């Protein structure tokens, strides 16, 4: 994927790994060496208008 | 072929009777031990007094 990781406060039970949002995308991760939980948002991205 | 328990422990102060309530079950283990399995019976302990 691709996105910014930030430390989040997520209560994930200890046998989850990742958190699925409602549309089914891997919003938060387990980090596999460090058993902490890092949420995943997408890098800023926007329309252009002039 | 995997042996996946789950378990839940409720504190229930009900004298007999299966409780009316909800509860999740979390998973407690998986084991891969890949065998086949078409019955299966309890055991309980016994307590010996003179
Ligand atoms: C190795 O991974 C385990 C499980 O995630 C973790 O507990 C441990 O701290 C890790 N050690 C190293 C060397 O990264």
Same mark, same amino acid.
């Given at each position: 994927?691709?996105?910014?990781?930030? #430390?989040?406060?997520?209560? $994930?039970?200890? $046998?989850?790994? $990742?958190?699925? =949002?409602?549309?089914?995308?891997? =919003?938060?991760?387990?980090?596999?060496?460090?058993? #902490?939980?890092? =949420?995943?948002?997408?890098?800023? $991205?926007?329309?252009?208008?002039? | 072929?995997?042996?996946?328990?789950?378990?839940?422990?409720?504190?229930?102060? &009900?004298? *007999?009777? &299966?409780?009316?309530?909800?509860?999740? &079950?979390?998973? /407690?283990?998986?084991?891969?031990?890949?065998?086949?399995?078409? *019955?299966?019976?309890? &055991?309980?302990?016994?307590? /010996?007094?003179?």
């Amino acid at each position: 994927g691709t996105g910014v990781l930030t #430390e989040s406060n997520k209560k $994930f039970l200890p $046998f989850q790994q $990742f958190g699925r =949002d409602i549309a089914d995308t891997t =919003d938060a991760v387990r980090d596999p060496q460090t058993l #902490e939980i890092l =949420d995943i948002t997408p890098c800023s $991205f926007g329309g252009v208008s002039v | 072929g995997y042996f996946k328990i789950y378990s839940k422990h409720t504190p229930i102060n &009900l004298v *007999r009777g &299966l409780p009316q309530g909800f509860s999740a &079950l979390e998973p /407690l283990v998986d084991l891969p031990i890949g065998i086949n399995i078409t *019955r299966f019976q309890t &055991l309980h302990i016994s307590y /010996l007094t003179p």
